[PDB]
Amino acid sequence: AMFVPGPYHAPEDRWLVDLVRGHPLAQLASNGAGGAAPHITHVPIIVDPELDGPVDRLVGITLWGHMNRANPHWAALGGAANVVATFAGPNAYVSPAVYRTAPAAPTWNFTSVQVRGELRKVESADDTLATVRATVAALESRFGAGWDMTGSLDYFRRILPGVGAFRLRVAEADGMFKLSQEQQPAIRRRVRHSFGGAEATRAVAGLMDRLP
Amino acid sequence: GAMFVPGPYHAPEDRWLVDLVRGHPLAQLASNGAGGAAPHITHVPIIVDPELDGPVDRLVGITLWGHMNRANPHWAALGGAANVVATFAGPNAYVSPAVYRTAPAAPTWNFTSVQVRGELRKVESADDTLATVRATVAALESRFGAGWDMTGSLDYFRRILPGVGAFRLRVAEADGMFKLSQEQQPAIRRRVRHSFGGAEATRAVAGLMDRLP
């Protein structure tokens, strides 16, 4: 359901899980009614926080998300919507100047995970509050500064009615790791070296370093 | 509208949406899946019509150019006059309530997004396919590159051209999400802006926050 050329497959299933954890603000897409363009909403999605033990594969697990119930996308999902959620990681423009070869064409290195399955809306106030608390736990740990939600739990309950929490059972998962694997080894090394020298591109260089 | 954007997160000026498209040309192109399936999503390079002169302040009514792989099933799936959305994602950063130094609070994610909607029309001519990719080099190498000169590769482009699926997208609708702490009180907005200015990873978000009225 996602087109990934052979050379851009992750070396291990765990790479797709690592991208979802590192880039939780996903683009959630569902079909537009009457041949209209898809609905797209940026939503915070995490892996099922009740999974204990290493999560090596996305297929078969449940993701947890929320959006604004007042967003018209929530009404458009209906009951049993087949959805895609796209997670986008590190990326960078590849200048052929870096290759020091000729002839050439530029490209864009990038990382994507597309997960597909059925979206189920959460109606339970308990499950909705679990969703947003788990999201805080996961994102404050990875991206934040040790903020303690304990003193804000009453506030969470006060604004809870606006939350559209959901569950996405992952039927299909595809990962684009477009990282110059199509180039000859010395050229891949020149790209990696070039991306090492600047903050905007170091995370791409980091992934290129981890390919077998 | 086709994109949900709370009032506080509207761009100050139409120009902000054009700027984000120019800044973040690798868009997520979405069209409907067949028979209830989830949408097809492809990352594709997309540029403003290179023939526009004058300041470009508004996306609505301009044509965007882009290309993708013909081998990608998404190309066949678009068929004729497919209604599509292309989403451009700019600077973004998680907002810890630790930065607010206020209670109670909840975290958020500051982010920027432009969604353009209209009818994708395929280019089938080799001449307009070659134009598409040469215009894309000119626009992207200048903005993101390292002074590469395509001159030596102009014939090479023609020698690798058949796999290119070039397209045009006339923008019927453009919506912009500029989620940049506009909902917070001014003193809290300033604390987020100063926190984001203290690391290169978040400086671009701080830059946009600094340009709000």
Ligand code: HEM
């Ligand atoms: C932990 C990080 C969190 C992030 C990144 C986050 C992000 C978001 C985003 C992006 C939306 C808008 C979705 C749309 O456009 O429909 C949203 C909506 C909402 N979220 Fe969260 N959220 C988080 C935690 C929470 C918490 C802890 C609560 C507590 C109840 C909460 C309550 C809401 C509510 C009420 C809305 C809908 C109304 C509104 O957006 O103001 N969120 N959230």
Ligand code: HEM
């Ligand atoms: C200027 C920057 C460029 C960028 C960022 C870029 C980006 C891309 C991307 C992301 C794809 C894959 C789309 C998909 O999954 O369907 C694509 C496909 C393609 N591009 Fe470009 N493109 C660039 C310039 C060029 C140029 C100058 C040529 C010359 C003909 C070209 C030839 C192709 C071809 C043949 C394909 C089909 C698949 C393949 O062979 O890789 N591109 N391009």
Ligand SMILES: O=C(O)[C@@H]1CCCNN1
């Ligand atoms: O993201 C926001 O700004 C709103 C308020 C608090 C956290 N999630 N919804």
